Design a protein around this ligand. Sequence first.
Ligand code: NAG
Ligand code: NAG
Ligand code: NAG
Lengths: 355, 355, 355
Amino acid sequence: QQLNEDLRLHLLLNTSVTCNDGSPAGYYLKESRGSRRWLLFLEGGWYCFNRENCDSRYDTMSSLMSSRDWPRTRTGTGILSSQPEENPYWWNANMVFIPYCSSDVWSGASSKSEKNEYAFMGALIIQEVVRELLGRGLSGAKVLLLAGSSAGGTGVLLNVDRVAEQLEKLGYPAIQVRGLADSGWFLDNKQYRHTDCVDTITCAPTEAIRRGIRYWNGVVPERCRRQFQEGEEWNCFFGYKVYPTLRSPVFVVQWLFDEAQLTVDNVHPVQEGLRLYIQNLGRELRHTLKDVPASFAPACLSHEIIIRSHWTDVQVKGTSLPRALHCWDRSLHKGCPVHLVDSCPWPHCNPSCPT
Amino acid sequence: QQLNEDLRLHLLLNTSVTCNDGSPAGYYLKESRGSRRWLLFLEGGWYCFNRENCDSRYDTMSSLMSSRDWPRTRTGTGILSSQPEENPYWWNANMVFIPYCSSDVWSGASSKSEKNEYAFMGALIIQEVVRELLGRGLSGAKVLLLAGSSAGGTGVLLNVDRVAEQLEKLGYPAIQVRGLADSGWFLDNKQYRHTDCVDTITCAPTEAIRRGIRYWNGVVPERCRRQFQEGEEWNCFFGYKVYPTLRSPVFVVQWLFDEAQLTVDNVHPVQEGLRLYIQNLGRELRHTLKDVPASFAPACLSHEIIIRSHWTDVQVKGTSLPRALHCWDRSLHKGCPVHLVDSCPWPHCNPSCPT
Amino acid sequence: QQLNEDLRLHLLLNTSVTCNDGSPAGYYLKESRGSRRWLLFLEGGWYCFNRENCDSRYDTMSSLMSSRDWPRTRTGTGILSSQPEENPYWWNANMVFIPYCSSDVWSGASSKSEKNEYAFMGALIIQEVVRELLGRGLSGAKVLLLAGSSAGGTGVLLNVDRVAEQLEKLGYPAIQVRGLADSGWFLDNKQYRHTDCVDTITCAPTEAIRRGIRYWNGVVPERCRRQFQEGEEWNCFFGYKVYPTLRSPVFVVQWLFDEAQLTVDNVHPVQEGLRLYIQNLGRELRHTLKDVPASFAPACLSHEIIIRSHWTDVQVKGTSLPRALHCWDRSLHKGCPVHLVDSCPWPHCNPSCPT
Ligand SMILES: *[C@@H]1O[C@H](CO)[C@@H](O)[C@H](O)[C@H]1NC(C)=O
Ligand SMILES: *[C@@H]1O[C@H](CO)[C@@H](O)[C@H](O)[C@H]1NC(C)=O
Ligand SMILES: *[C@@H]1O[C@H](CO)[C@@H](O)[C@H](O)[C@H]1NC(C)=O
C-alpha cells in the first residue's frame, strides 16, 4: 500500500563487499524516470574504533553492522520524500538510501578481513553502489547529489571527489557530482572536561579518528592527505580542513551546537566554566564557515536534519533550508541567499529550533 | 446592527441596462468621506457561452443572472473590509461591490436582446455604475482601483482602460484609474486530457471565449483587438496577451495553480503524465509574469483571494499581499518589493497556502 | 530556589538620597563576572506634578513612592532575563534594575525637601547608583547600556549624557555609555478632546511636564536647555527635541500608538474625527523617527516592551527587536537593519502585535 511508493532494497551482487559481520551490503532505490537528478544518501550513526567497542556495538546495535534485519522497502523522508509539502524542490528526484553497516565513517577500504572479525568497507560500498546504479539510469544523469547525515555527512566529505573521479574515469562526464553534508562538520577542539578515550561517546574526536583510521584501514582524499604529514590522515575527517581542497561543490548544513559534537566534547542555570565553553564552541564553528560560501547553520542544539520530516520548520534570517538548497542549485547554473549562519550565541536563541 | 457598517444596494436608474434575465442591475456602496480612494470590485463566477448552458445556469445559479435575490446590504470583506486587522492599508477607502449578473466576463455590450432570451451587458453595467458614482463623490477622487476576482479579474483587464477613457472623456482627469486583477490571468494552453466543449467546466479556455464573445456580443480593448486578426478578439481575454497594451497600471495576483485553470484544463501519488502537466503549467505561468513588474503569485492550488477574509495569511518571500499592494501604491507616487513569484514547483510547496 | 538566580536589592548607603516619602532609594543587582556589559534599567510608571496628585498616588500606588515594600530580590525578565530563549544576545550581561520611587521622570535634583512633603531626587538616585556600581565591577566595563521603559525611557533621554559625563569626570573613559529608550518618545501634540489639566491621566503632555519640572525642581540636558528659551526646559522631555543634541548613542523603541500617549491625548467602528486623529498621530510619530537612524516602531496599541517576557514575539519587516538591538551593537564596532518602522496606519494592522 505504502510499499508501492517506497524505496526498494537491493543487496550488492558482488558479495566480496560486505557489512561489518560479513553479510552483504546494499542500497534502497526508487527511480523517477521523469527526472535526471539523483540523490544518494549516506546514513550515519557513529562508528567503532576498536574490537571491544565493535563487539559492544554488535550486541546493542547490530542493525548498523549487518543487513540481516534490513526491511525489503523504506519510506523516503525529508529530502528523500516524494511528497512536495515535505520536499518542495527535490520531491521528483531518483532517491537512494545507502544504509550504514561499516562503522567506519564510509572510509573503509579493507578488501578482506580475517574470519571471526569485522570488515570495514565503507568506501568500497559507495563505489559498488555507484557502479550498479550506472546500469539503472544514473548513466543518463545531470546531477548526482551525494548527501549524508552525521557520520554520513562526514562520509560525503570523504567520498564526494572519489565518486566524481570514479565517474570521470568511467566516461560519464556530463554528470555533475555534488555534495551535501549534514551534521558532519566537526571541530577537533579540546574537550570541556578531558576524559579518557575508551567508549565511542567519551573519546575526543581527534583520538577517535586517529585510532579508527588505522583500525578501519581508512582512506582520505589525496589532495587533503598531501597537505598534512604522513600518518596524519585524521585531519581530513574534519570538514574545515578537508573542505578547501574539494573539487566538487558541497553545501554544508550544521547545527551550531551539534549533539554529537557536545557528546565527544563531553558536555552534559549552568556553570560559568561551561558557559564559556559552549559559547566559544558556537563561535569557533561560526568562524569555520566564513569561507564556506554555501551553508546553513542555526543556533540549535540538535542532530541531523535532511531526512527528518520537519526539516522545513527551521529558519535562518527568514530562510528555510530547502530554499537555501534551491538558491544553491541556482548558483551552479541576489534575492536568493546561500550563506545562512545564526549570529545568536546560545542553543535555542533561535525560536524556530526543533524540539 | 451590522447593517450600519455595510455596503448598500443601489439598483441602476437606467432600466435599459439589466442582468441576464431582464431584471435591473446595480451596485453595493459604502462611502467614506474622509477618503479620496475608491475601490470598485467586480464579482466573478464563470460565464455561459450558449443558450442551453445559460438555461442550466439559471436553474442552478440564478443569483448570478438576476437581482431578484440580492440582499439590501452586504458586509465588506478582504480589500473591501473597513476592519484594519483584515484590511491594513485600504480599510478607509470608498467601497464598491458590483455583482456579476451578466455571465459574460464583463465584456457584454448588447444594448438590446430579444424577449424570452438573455441580455449580456457586462461592459455597460460597469459604464453605468461609473456614471452614477460621479454623482456621489467619485468626481472628487484621486485613485479609482478597479478590482475583481476570477471572471471579475479578467473583467478588470477588459474594462480598466475603457473606464480610464470614460472619465477622461467626461472631464475628470485628476482621477488615476488602476486595475487589480485577481485569479483572472489564464493560459490558453492545451488541456491535459482533451475533452469536447459542452459544459462550462469542460470547455477549453480558448474555445469557451471564442464562442462566448460572439454569443455575448463581447468587446475587447481596441489596442489589443488591433494586434490580432479580425475575428480573433478572444486572444484579448488572456492576460499575458492583453497586458502589454494596457495604458492603466495593473497589479496581477494569481495562484500559480488556479482551480479554475485546472478545471478548464480538465485536471482532477499522481500519474507521471499528469505530474509533467501540472508542473509545466506553473512554469508557463511563472514565465508569463516575468514582464509583469507588479505581481503576487504563490505556489498554491486555490481560487480568488482579494475579498476573502484570510487574504493576509499567505506570504511569498517573506511578504504578504497587502504589503505588496502598498509598495505598489508607493511605486506610483527598495525595501518595498512588488514582484513576488514562488519558485517552488508544486501546489502547497509553499506552507502559507490557505486550505 | 529562584532566589539564587535573581537580582538582589541594595539600599543606597547615602541616606540623603531618598524616595518620595523619605525612605531610602536603591537598586537590584545581579553580576555576571564573565561579562563586561552592563544593563541599567530605569523603571517607569507615570509621575505626579503637584501635591494633591502625589498624595493621591501615595494612597493608591505607594510602591512607586517608597522602598518600604520592595522585596529582597527580583527575577530578571525580557532584556534583564538570564534565559537565552527570552534574551538571545544580552542574557549574560550584568543586570541592574533601579526602581522608580521619585515620581519625577528621573529629572529630580532637589537635594532637600521640607518635612511632611515629598522629595524628588530622580537624577541623583541614578548618579548615586552609578557611583556605587563603580565599586562592584562597573569600573571594568566596556558597555553601559542605560535602558528604561515609559517614564524610565524618557529618563534615559534625560540622564544618558549626564552618566556619560559622570564617568568621564571620574576617569573611567574606556566605558561606552549608551541609551535604550522604550515607550518614552512622546509628542507634544494637541489632545483629541482638550481637557483641563487636573489628573495625571488627563493632563496634556506639555502642561504636565511644564508643571512637573518646577515642582520636582527638574533638570534637563544642558545642550538641549540651551536650544530653547529659559523657562522652556519642558521641551527637553520630548524625544524628537532632545535627541539631536545627544552625544551618546541611543536606540529608540516605540509603539506607534502608545497607550500612554493616547491617554494624555485623551483618546478612549469609530468616530470619523477620531479616525483622523489616531491616524495622523501614527504619522506624526513615524515622521519624528525618520532622522533617528536606530529604531523599532510597530503599528501597535501597546505600552512598554523591553522587560516584558514576550518581547521577542513582535516583528517589523521580518525582524525582531533583539535582532535589531544586535545589529545596532554591530554598527558601533548590510543584512543587519536597525531602522524598523511600520508603514501600516492603524493599531494592529501589524499581526505580530501582542495582546
Ligand atoms: C565486485 O564485482 C564487480 C563485478 O565483477 C567488479 O567490477 C568490482 O570491481 C568488484 N569489487 C571487488 C572488491 O572485488
Ligand atoms: C441610461 O440612462 C442614462 C441617463 O439617461 C444615459 O446617460 C445612459 O447613457 C443610458 N444608457 C443606455 C444604454 O441607454
Ligand atoms: C552621598 O554620599 C556619598 C559618599 O559620602 C557622596 O560621595 C555623594 O556625593 C553624596 N550625595 C549627597 C547628595 O550628599
